[PDB]
């Protein structure tokens, strides 16, 4: 279509630096706007990178409240691409294994298992998170 | 659908108790090909209808189904254009007569109740046909607040939180029914947006600020005003960006 | 004024039930002026919400005593509101299976209020409930006498749905008195009356 | 009962409607409810699918004017 | 206007147009009226086809005087014409006699208006039946005005859709010793059999007449009465 | 079928056929066009001569309903004349009550309601003529309203009533009327009427021209013969 | 015919209980079904 591609290749590293500097609440709004342009454009690969990007920023910055709020929010966007949400959940369930803090891991599991409920494209993940939740 | 005599040609009862002539007047609302939508918010009422100018030869400033019945009362007419103007002229006369005789501005509920009363006589006397038009009034009451009233060819009338009349009345009723079920006291911007959206979603047009006329009444300014193409563009831009 | 306490009582619902109970009681014991259209609405609402809470706490003195305490109050609110108030409070006590021993007493007191206010339809439902209380308390002879009067009154007004329940209670009362011939006769009447109408699934199960 | 419904689905909302519909209509409503779930790559029918399926299947024109009652 | 009667006698000696007007009454929303010992209750099914309608905007139980009230079953617009005529007739009575119009007098005056449209030129009969309730001389009054112009004094009656079954329901549920509150209960029960869906405080309209006069019960009041049904 | 014999009877599809039949009387008449240019309104009527026995000026389809409003008609000429006097008496009453020349928007709205009033009852028939009212003033500006037998009045930049209304509308669209003046448009109105005229069909027409604008000081008048003949030569030359 | 239908329904009610002889209960329950229900 109007595939953005290099457009997100210009923002994403720039947004990566600002996240480390401390500006996170503002850049996610910037990436939310950039996600909206890509999602409407039906750019599968670009939108997938943004959704995977934002969850990484909230993970590396230990923003557990913001990470869970974002996961719910970006999954509920209007006409969200199913493959892009899959990559977000696949990348997010990796963060589940890394996290050792039980209350934080459980809330992320409950959040992730809620955004993957009833959806075929993320049915493998929700299974593995259900297995992960059971072992805990 | 039984018939006996002239029950199809004059406003007299059918064997099953139906006024076919009055029913046929309802089909005349769809003859114009236009849909009107009225939505009432917490402090505003908006009437929106589509404007069609088939050729550049026609003066688009004169194609208006939005009529300023009073300084504080405005209406959107759907149906036969000629019959619609007659109701508007009659409604203006009754509004002026009410002010002269009673000393205060005519309530919106009483304005159509007279128009509904006027149109009922056409449904009882066989010498005249019912007016094939539907009238939707909007106005801010002193106490009841925003008001929306439809005014059918048969003399039926009711208050509406969100009504619609025309070709797509039933499809727009379902959309408005879904929105009111959410139970949100909409602001002025939301009410215009849900009024424009209702016409847009049902017709699937993605309006330009030259294909719809928007008329609003607000509590802060209880006066009926026609939104300019620039003003309609602001809502169309805001709706698109979300 | 008193409306704020209602939200405070509503806020205390998440807390201990007895903690909110003090808030609702204070409104209930609060005296009212001539009309106080806002206060009586809150006072009636509190009394309905307080009794609903007591259906979980199970306090006979506070639930049974509530009905006996508010009889003067029922002369202030509208008759429909008062009748709904008596029905709601009295139903909650008897749905509470705790056999405090005074159930037949205030239920008879309610019927006396129904007769005083000439609320016939309200009285019939309480009488049909009183027959069930009599059977549950083993006052078999009194249960039949009250039911027999109710059967004639329900027959005249063709209240078949309520009629079937009374005949079943008469059927159960005779069966407990070890009178199979009269229990079967009463059950026969209940089945025939039920066949004449539509039975709600609760009534059909009780008949079956 | 044979369909993977969500707990948020209240069937009484559509049962209580005054539309005079048949078992084929009710089967179509549930059938189209799973149609929307399948379209959105889902396996659980939520309330929004049932609301859209009911509206599509019924599609009852008013056919009655209010002034008659 | 046309100067010839649109209502004429059929060869079988029937005013066929009047019968067809009564057919419209049978298609209207049910209306139930009960004359209890201490008052009269008027109840109707005020059910809208969507929530978008404002229920309180238009009322089906409309007062005529401080002591007389109307409820109809039939065509909505025609009822308003008779409501205005009844109020005008009630006033014309009041200016001359300086006394509230008796219930029987208003029905006779209103029924005369209904008869005119069954004989006048170029007009069709009103497709409504009027249930008139009032209080005069310390006694409750209930009347029904058919489209033909005939007025009947009813102890308890039902009009509109499923009126035949509602009338029989009242025969087995009405007694002259009934009180006003039990009349409201019996009225809502009478509506319930013909009612489809559930009866809320907004989809039915109940009006009562007593020594204090005629008033239309607010939706809050109808809710208390409705709670006793279930 | 009986659904088309009275104006007080609706068809089952909600259409008054008696009004629509009156529309057909207009579509059987010769074409009259009106163009609202930058500084006025110019009227042009294709006026066929039914016989050589008619004098030049008979059956004038261009009327003067006021000193500032013209009227180009099409359809039943008797009904067109009757609607002319209704417009004349409406304009006369407006001046005798409010004290100023009647606005063309109000004149169109007033006459159209008179036309609409004949579309509701079986005691009268709809007027079988469609007409255009054109006016100019310093304040209101050039206005051109067309009223149909149903009673519908819309403003126009260029309008055509008659049997070649569709053909004339295509020719009017090619014009840039909002920028050119009456002097340039009278030639164009002549050209369009000559284009849509059918010589093999009903022939021997007379060009009736009238205008109202700032060059007539807001007064409707017949285009002078010198300009009318100049436009006629240009119109005839455009046909090659 | 309604009287006859009551009898045939009374025999049905005995069959619903797998009885052989029609009892008075069956006739009464048949009366209620034929008249009141229908």
Swiss-Prot record, chain B:
Gene Ontology CC terms: cilium; cytoplasm; cytosol; extracellular exosome; mitochondrion; myofibril; nuclear matrix; nucleoplasm
Tagged with keyword Cytoplasm: yes
Coiled-coil ranges from the UniProt annotation: none
Biological processes, Gene Ontology terms: positive regulation of canonical NF-kappaB signal transduction; proteasome-mediated ubiquitin-dependent protein catabolic process; proteolysis involved in protein catabolic process; regulation of inflammatory response
Key words, A-Z: Acetylation, Cytoplasm, Glycoprotein, Nucleus, Phosphoprotein, Proteasome
Phosphotyrosine: residues bearing it: 156
UniProt modified residues of type Phosphoserine: 14, 60-61
PANTHER family recorded: PROTEASOME SUBUNIT ALPHA/BETA (PTHR11599)
Quaternary state and interactors: The 26S proteasome consists of a 20S proteasome core and two 19S regulatory subunits. The 20S proteasome core is a barrel-shaped complex made of 28 subunits that are arranged in four stacked rings. The two outer rings are each formed by seven alpha subunits, and the two inner rings are formed by seven beta subunits. The proteolytic activity is exerted by three beta-subunits PSMB5, PSMB6 and PSMB7. Interacts with ALKBH4.
Stated name of the protein: Proteasome subunit alpha type-6
Protein's organism: Homo sapiens
Gene giving rise to this polypeptide: PSMA6
From Swiss-Prot, chain C:
Induction pattern: By FOXO4; expression in embryonic stem cells (ESCs) is mediated by FOXO4.
Phosphoserine carried by residues: 11, 20
Places the protein is found: Nucleus; Cytoplasm, Cytosol
Post-translational modification: Phosphorylated by AMPK.
Tissue: Highly expressed in embryonic stem cells (ESCs). Expression decreases as ESCs differentiate.
Domain of life of the source: Eukaryota
Quaternary structure annotation from Swiss-Prot or TrEMBL: Component of the 19S proteasome regulatory particle complex. The 26S proteasome consists of a 20S core particle (CP) and two 19S regulatory subunits (RP). The regulatory particle is made of a lid composed of 9 subunits including PSMD11, a base containing 6 ATPases and few additional components.
Entry similarity comment: Belongs to the proteasome subunit S9 family.
Task of the protein: Component of the 26S proteasome, a multiprotein complex involved in the ATP-dependent degradation of ubiquitinated proteins. This complex plays a key role in the maintenance of protein homeostasis by removing misfolded or damaged proteins, which could impair cellular functions, and by removing proteins whose functions are no longer required. Therefore, the proteasome participates in numerous cellular processes, including cell cycle progression, apoptosis, or DNA damage repair. In the complex, PSMD11 is required for proteasome assembly.
Protein name: 26S proteasome non-ATPase regulatory subunit 11
From Swiss-Prot, chain D:
Compartment(s) where it occurs, according to its Swiss-Prot or TrEMBL record: Cytoplasm; Nucleus
Modified residues (N6-acetyllysine): 48, 52
Disulphide linkage map: none
Family: Belongs to the AAA ATPase family.
Subunit structure as annotated in this protein's UniProt entry: Component of the 19S proteasome regulatory particle complex. The 26S proteasome consists of a 20S core particle (CP) and two 19S regulatory subunits (RP). The regulatory particle is made of a lid composed of 9 subunits, a base containing 6 ATPases including PSMC4 and few additional components. Interacts with NR1I3. Interacts with PAAF1. Interacts with TRIM5. Interacts with ZFAND1.
Summary of the function given for this chain in its UniProt record: Component of the 26S proteasome, a multiprotein complex involved in the ATP-dependent degradation of ubiquitinated proteins. This complex plays a key role in the maintenance of protein homeostasis by removing misfolded or damaged proteins, which could impair cellular functions, and by removing proteins whose functions are no longer required. Therefore, the proteasome participates in numerous cellular processes, including cell cycle progression, apoptosis, or DNA damage repair.
Name this protein carries in UniProt: 26S proteasome regulatory subunit 6B
Provenance organism: Homo sapiens
First and last residues shown, out of full length: 350 to 418 of 418
Swiss-Prot record, chain F:
Keywords (A to Z) from UniProt: Acetylation, Cytoplasm, Host-virus interaction, Nucleus, Phosphoprotein, Proteasome
Listed InterPro entries: Ntn_hydrolases_N, Proteasome_alpha, Proteasome_alpha-type, Proteasome_asu_N, Proteasome_sua/b
CDD domains: proteasome_alpha_type_3 (cd03751)
GO molecular function, one term: ubiquitin protein ligase binding
Modified residues (N6-acetyllysine): 52, 201, 225
Inducing stimuli: Down-regulated by antioxidants BO-653 and probucol. Up-regulated by bacterial lipopolysaccharides (LPS) and TNF.
Keyword Zinc (UniProt): no
Coiled-coil features, chain-numbered ranges: none
TM regions (residue ranges): none
GO cellular component: cytoplasm; cytosol; extracellular exosome; nucleoplasm; nucleus; proteasome complex; proteasome core complex; proteasome core complex, alpha-subunit complex
PROSITE patterns: PROTEASOME_ALPHA_1, PROTEASOME_ALPHA_2
Phosphoserine modification, residue list: 238
Family in the record: Belongs to the peptidase T1A family.
Protein name: Proteasome subunit alpha type-3
Organism, as annotated: Homo sapiens (Human)
Gene: PSMA3
């Amino acid at each position: 279509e109007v595939d953005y591609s290099a457009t997100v290749d210009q923002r994403l590293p720039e947004c990566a630096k600002l996240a480390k500097e401390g500006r996170l609440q503002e850049v996610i709004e910037t990436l939310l706007s950039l996600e909206k342009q890509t999602r409407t454009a039906s750019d599968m690969v670009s939108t997938s990178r943004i959704l995977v990007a934002v969850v990484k920023m909230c993970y590396e910055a230990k923003e557990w409240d913001l990470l869970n709020e974002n996961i719910m929010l970006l999954s509920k966007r209007r006409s969200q691409l199913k493959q892009a949400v899959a990559k977000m959940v696949q990348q997010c369930c990796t963060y589940v294994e890394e996290i050792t803090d039980l209350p934080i891991k459980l809330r992320l599991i409950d959040t992730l298992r809620m955004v993957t409920e009833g959806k075929i494209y993320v049915e493998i993940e929700r299974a593995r998170l259900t297995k992960t939740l059971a072992t805990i | 659908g039984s018939s006996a005599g002239f029950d199809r040609h004059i406003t007299i009862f059918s064997p099953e108790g139906r006024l076919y002539q009055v029913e046929y007047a309802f089909k005349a609302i769809n003859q114009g090909g236009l849909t009107s939508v009225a939505v009432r918010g917490k402090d505003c009422a908006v009437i929106v209808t589509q404007k069609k100018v088939p050729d550049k030869l026609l003066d688009s400033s004169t194609v208006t189904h939005l009529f300023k019945i009073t300084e504080n009362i405005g209406c959107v007419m759907t149906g036969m254009t000629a019959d619609s103007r007659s109701q508007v002229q009659r409604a203006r006369y009754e509004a002026a007569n009410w002010k002269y005789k009673y000393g205060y501005e005519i309530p919106v509920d009483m304005l159509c109740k007279r128009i509904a009363d006027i149109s009922q006589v056409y449904t009882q006397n066989a010498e005249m046909r019912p007016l094939g038009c539907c009238m939707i009034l909007i106005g801010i009451d002193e106490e009841q607040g925003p008001q929306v009233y439809k005014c059918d060819p048969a003399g039926y009338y009711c208050g509406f939180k969100a009504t619609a009349a025309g070709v797509k009345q039933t499809e727009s009723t379902s959309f408005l029914e879904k929105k009111v079920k959410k139970k949100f006291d909409w602001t002025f911007e939301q009410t215009v947006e849900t009024a424009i959206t209702c016409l847009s979603t049902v017709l699937s047009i993605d309006f330009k600020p030259s294909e719809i006329e928007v008329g609003v009444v607000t509590v802060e300014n209880p006066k009926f005003r026609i939104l300019t193409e620039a003003e309609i563009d602001a809502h169309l831009v805001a709706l698109a960006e979300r | 004024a008193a409306v704020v306490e209602f939200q405070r009582a509503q806020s205390l619902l998440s807390t201990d039930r007895e903690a909110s109970i003090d808030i609702l009681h204070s409104i209930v014991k609060r005296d009212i002026q001539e009309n106080d259209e806002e206060a009586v609405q809150v006072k009636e609402q509190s009394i309905l919400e307080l009794g609903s809470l007591l259906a979980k706490t199970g306090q006979a003195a506070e639930l049974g005593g509530l009905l006996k305490y508010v009889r003067p109050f029922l002369n202030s609110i509208s008759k429909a509101k008062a009748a709904r108030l008596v029905r709601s409070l009295l139903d909650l006590f008897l749905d509470m299976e705790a056999a405090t021993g005074q159930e037949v007493e205030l239920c008879l007191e309610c019927i006396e209020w129904a007769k005083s206010e000439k609320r016939t339809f309200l009285r019939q439902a309480l009488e049909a409930r009183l027959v069930s209380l009599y059977f549950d308390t083993k006052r078999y002879q009194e249960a039949l006498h009250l039911g027999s009067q109710l059967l004639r009154e329900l027959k005249k007004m063709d209240d078949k749905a309520l009629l079937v329940e009374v005949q079943l209670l008469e059927s159960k009362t005779y069966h407990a008195l070890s009178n199979l011939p009269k229990a079967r006769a009463a059950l026969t009447s209940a089945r025939t009356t039920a066949n004449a109408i539509y039975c709600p699934p609760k009534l059909q199960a009780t008949l079956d | 009962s044979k369909m993977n419904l969500s707990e948020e689905v209240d069937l009484e909302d559509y049962v209580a409607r005054p539309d005079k519909i048949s078992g084929a209509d009710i089967n179509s409503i549930c059938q189209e409810s799973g149609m929307l779930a399948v379209r959105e790559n889902r396996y659980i029918v939520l309330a929004k699918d049932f609301e859209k399926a009911y509206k599509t299947v019924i599609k009852k024109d008013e056919q009655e004017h209010e002034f008659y009652k | 206007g046309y100067s010839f009667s649109l209502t004429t006698f059929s060869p079988s000696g029937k005013l066929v147009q009047i019968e067809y007007a009564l057919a419209a009454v049978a298609g209207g929303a049910p209306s139930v009226g009960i004359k209890a010992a201490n008052g009269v209750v008027l109840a109707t099914e005020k059910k809208q086809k969507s929530i978008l309608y404002d229920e309180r905007s238009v009322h089906k139980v409309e007062p005529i005087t401080k002591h007389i009230g109307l409820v109809y079953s039939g065509m909505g617009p025609d009822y308003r014409v008779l409501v205005h005529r009844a109020r005008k007739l009630a006033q014309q009575y009041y200016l001359v006699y300086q006394e509230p119009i008796p219930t029987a007098q208003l029905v006779q005056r209103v029924a005369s208006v209904m008869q005119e449209y069954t004989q006048s030129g170029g007009v069709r009969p009103f497709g409504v039946s009027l249930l008139i309730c009032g209080w005069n001389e310390g006694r409750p009054y209930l009347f029904q005005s058919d489209p033909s112009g005939a007025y009947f004094a009813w102890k308890a009656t039902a009009m509109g859709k499923n009126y035949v079954n509602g009338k029989t329901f009242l025969e087995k549920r009405y007694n002259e010793d009934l009180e006003l509150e039990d009349a409201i209960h019996t009225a809502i029960l009478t509506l319930k059999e013909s009612f489809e869906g559930q009866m809320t405080e907004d989809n039915i309209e109940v009006g009562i007449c007593n020594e204090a006069g005629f008033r239309r019960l607010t939706p809050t009041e109808v809710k208390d009465y409705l709670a006793a049904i279930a | 079928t009986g659904y088309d014999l009275s104006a007080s009877t609706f068809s089952p599809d909600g259409r008054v056929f008696q009004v629509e039949y009156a529309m057909k009387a207009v579509e059987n008449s010769s074409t009259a066009i009106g163009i609202r240019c930058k500084d006025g309104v110019v009227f042009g009527v294709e006026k066929l001569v039914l016989s050589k026995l008619y004098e030049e000026g008979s059956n004038k389809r261009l009327f003067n309903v006021d000193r500032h409003v013209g009227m180009a008609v099409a359809g039943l000429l008797a009904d067109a004349r009757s609607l002319a006097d209704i417009a004349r008496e409406e304009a006369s009453n407006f001046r005798s009550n409010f004290g100023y020349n009647i606005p063309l928007k109000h004149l169109a709205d007033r006459v159209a309601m008179y036309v609409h009033a004949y579309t509701l009852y079986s005691a009268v028939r709809p007027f079988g003529c469609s007409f255009m009212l054109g006016s100019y003033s310093v304040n209101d500006g050039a206005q051109l309203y067309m009223i149909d037998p149903s009673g519908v009045s819309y403003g126009y930049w260029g309008c055509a009533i008659g049997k070649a209304r569709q053909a004339a509308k295509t020719e009017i669209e090619k014009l840039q009327m909002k920028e050119m003046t009456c002097r340039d448009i009278v030639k164009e109105v002549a050209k369009i009427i000559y284009i849509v005229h059918d010589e093999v069909k009903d022939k021997a027409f007379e060009l009736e021209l009238s205008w109202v604008g700032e060059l007539t000081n807001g007064r409707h008048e017949i285009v002078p013969k010198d300009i009318r003949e100049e436009a006629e030569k240009y119109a005839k030359e455009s046909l090659k | 015919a309604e009287v006859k239908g009551v009898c045939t329904e009374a025999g049905m009610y005995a069959l619903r209980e797998r009885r052989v002889h029609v009892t008075q209960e069956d006739f009464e329950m048949a009366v209620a079904k034929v008249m009141q229900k229908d």
